[PDB]
C-alpha cells in the first residue's frame, strides 16, 4: 500500500500569561514518532515510537535545533498575522502549519504538502504543482509575494520530492514491523433492549490499523443513514484503533439489518447480522 | 526529518 510522513505544528498565543505554547508532532501513516513541546522540561525533540530511538544523537541534536527554529518562526508568525489583520494583543490566537510526503506502493514520490491556517481557517497552501501558492485573503496575498521574492518553493519542493521522501522510506524499513503491518478489525456486535418495542444494534470494529475504515448499516440490503450513529474513529492507545456504528430498530425485526465493514487488511468486506 | 527553513508569514 501507499504511505505518508506528516509534521504538524501548533502555536497558540496566551498574551500576558507567558510566551506562545508551541507543539510539534510527527507522524508516519497513523503512527506518531516524534514530539516537541516549548513548555516541556527537556526542550528537545523526543521519540514517541520505539523504532525511531535507533537514530544516533546527531539526528536528535539536529531535529531539536530545527524544531526550535520552527517554535521561534511561528512565534513571529502570530505577531505578523495580528499586524496583517489589525487585531488587538489582548485576544488569544492559534497558528497551524502542516507539511509532508506521499509515496505510492512503489515507494515513488506521489505528492507534497505545505499548508497553513490561522485560528482554524486556510491561510496559505502550496499547490500540487510545488511551484506556486493559493492565498485566501489579502493578508495571505502579502505572504504570497514575500515567499515568491525569497524563492521558498525552490528547496521546499526539493525537500518534499527528495529528503522528505528519502527519510519516509528509511523509516518504513527501520519500523517495518509496526509501519508496514495491517491489523484487520476484530468485529462483533451487541444487542441492548432500550425497552419492549425498541432495541439497539451496535456494530463493533476493534484493534485495527491503519485507522481508515468504513461501517455502513443496511435495512434488507439497502443503505440506511436514518437513525444511525457513527462515532469518530478513536485510538485504543496501544497503536490500534476502534470504531462502532449503532442503529435503533423495532424489536423483533433484528435480523432484517446488516452491518458492512471495509478495511485494507480485510481481503473483502465482512457483513454482520444478528446471530 | 523536518524541513529546516520554515518560512515566516
Amino acid at each position, epitope marked *: 500500500g501507499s504511505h505518508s510522513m506528516r509534521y504538524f505544528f501548533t502555536s497558540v498565543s496566551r498574551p500576558g500569561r507567558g510566551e506562545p505554547r508551541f507543539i510539534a508532532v510527527g507522524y508516519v501513516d497513523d503512527t506518531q514518532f516524534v514530539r516537541f513541546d516549548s513548555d516541556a522540561a527537556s526542550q528537545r525533540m523526543e521519540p514517541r515510537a520505539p523504532w525511531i530511538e535507533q537514530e544516533g544523537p546527531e539526528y536528535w541534536d*539536529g531535529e531539536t*535545533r530545527k524544531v526550535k527554529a520552527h517554535s*521561534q*518562526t511561528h512565534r*513571529v508568525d502570530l505577531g505578523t498575522l495580528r499586524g496583517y489583520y489589525n487585531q488587538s494583543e489582548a485576544g488569544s490566537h492559534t497558528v497551524q502549519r502542516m507539511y509532508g510526503c506521499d509515496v505510492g506502493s512503489d515507494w515513488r514520490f506521489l505528492r507534497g504538502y505545505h499548508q497553513y491556517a490561522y485560528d482554524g481557517k486556510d491561510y496559505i497552501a502550496l499547490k500540487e504543482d510545488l511551484r506556486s501558492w493559493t492565498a485566501a485573503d489579502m493578508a495571505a496575498q502579502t505572504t504570497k509575494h514575500k515567499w515568491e521574492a525569497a524563492h521558498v518553493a*525552490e528547496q521546499l519542493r*526539493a*525537500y518534499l520530492e527528495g529528503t522528505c521522501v528519502e527519510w519516509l522510506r528509511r523509516y518504513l524499513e527501520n519500523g517495518k514491523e509496526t509501519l508496514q503491518r495491517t491489523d484487520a478489525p476484530k468485529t462483533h456486535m451487541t444487542h441492548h433492549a432500550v425497552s419492549d418495542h425498541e432495541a439497539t444494534l451496535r456494530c463493533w470494529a476493534l484493534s485495527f490499523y491503519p485507522a481508515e475504515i468504513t461501517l455502513t448499516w443496511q435495512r434488507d440490503g439497502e443503505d440506511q443513514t436514518q437513525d444511525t450513529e457513527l462515532v469518530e474513529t478513536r485510538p485504543a492507545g496501544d497503536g490500534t484503533f476502534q470504531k462502532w456504528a449503532a442503529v435503533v430498530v423495532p424489536s423483533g425485526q433484528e435480523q432484517r439489518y446488516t452491518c458492512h465493514v471495509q478495511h485494507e487488511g480485510l481481503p473483502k468486506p465482512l457483513t454482520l447480522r444478528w446471530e | 526529518r523536518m524541513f529546516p527553513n520554515a518560512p*515566516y508569514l
Partner: T-cell receptor
Amino acid sequence: DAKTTQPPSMDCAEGRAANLPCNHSTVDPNEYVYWYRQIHSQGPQYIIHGLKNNETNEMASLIITEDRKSSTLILPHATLRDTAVYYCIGGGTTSGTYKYIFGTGTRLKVLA
Amino acid sequence: GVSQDPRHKITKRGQNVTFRCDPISEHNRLYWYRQTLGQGPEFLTYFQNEAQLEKSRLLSDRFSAERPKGSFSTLEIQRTEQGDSAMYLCASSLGFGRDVMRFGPGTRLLVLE
C-alpha cells in the same frame, strides 16, 4: 560534515573567462551552495547561489553538473578587480546545523 | 547593510572587550564567524530571532553572544588571550528561501601582552 574542495591557487588572463572549480564532495543535493569573494582585511562579498539548475547574474554565472557533485563559477571577462579569494560553501541545513564550513578557497590572481 | 563596530580594536591581554553588530532588518538569522590571516571564516554562533540555537563546540565559555531584541547582537570576550586575535565577522540572513548569508565589514581584534 558538509565540506567542499577547491584548488589553492589559479592564474587567469585579463579579459578571458575565469573558470573556478569546486567539488561538493559531501554536500547534500537538496542544500544550497554559495560563492563568496574576499580581499585583505575585508568582509566576504556574496556572488551567487546554486541548487539544481545553473544560475547567472551581473557578477558571474555558476554551472551545476547533473550529479550536483561539482560546480563551476564563471567570470566572463575577468577584470583586475576580480583578483581575490573565492569560497565555495555548501549547506548542512538538512541535518540540524546552520553553520557553513569555509576551506582555504581558490586565490584567483587575474594577470593584466 | 550589515554593520559592525568597532572596525578595529587593540586590547591588553586580560582585559574584556565587546563588539556590536547591527544586522539587516527583516533578517531573522544572525551568525558570528571569526577569521585568522590566510584561513577561511570559522563559525562561532547562530541566532534565530533572540534564540542562540547553535554554539561552536570549539570557541566559547570566555565568549558570550547575546541578541536581546532579536535585532542587534553583541559578542563579549572576558579575560582576552593573545589567541583571540582575529577578524570577527557578523552575518545575517532572511531565515528562509535562498536564505543568503550577508557578511559585515568585521571587527579586527588584536590582543597584546
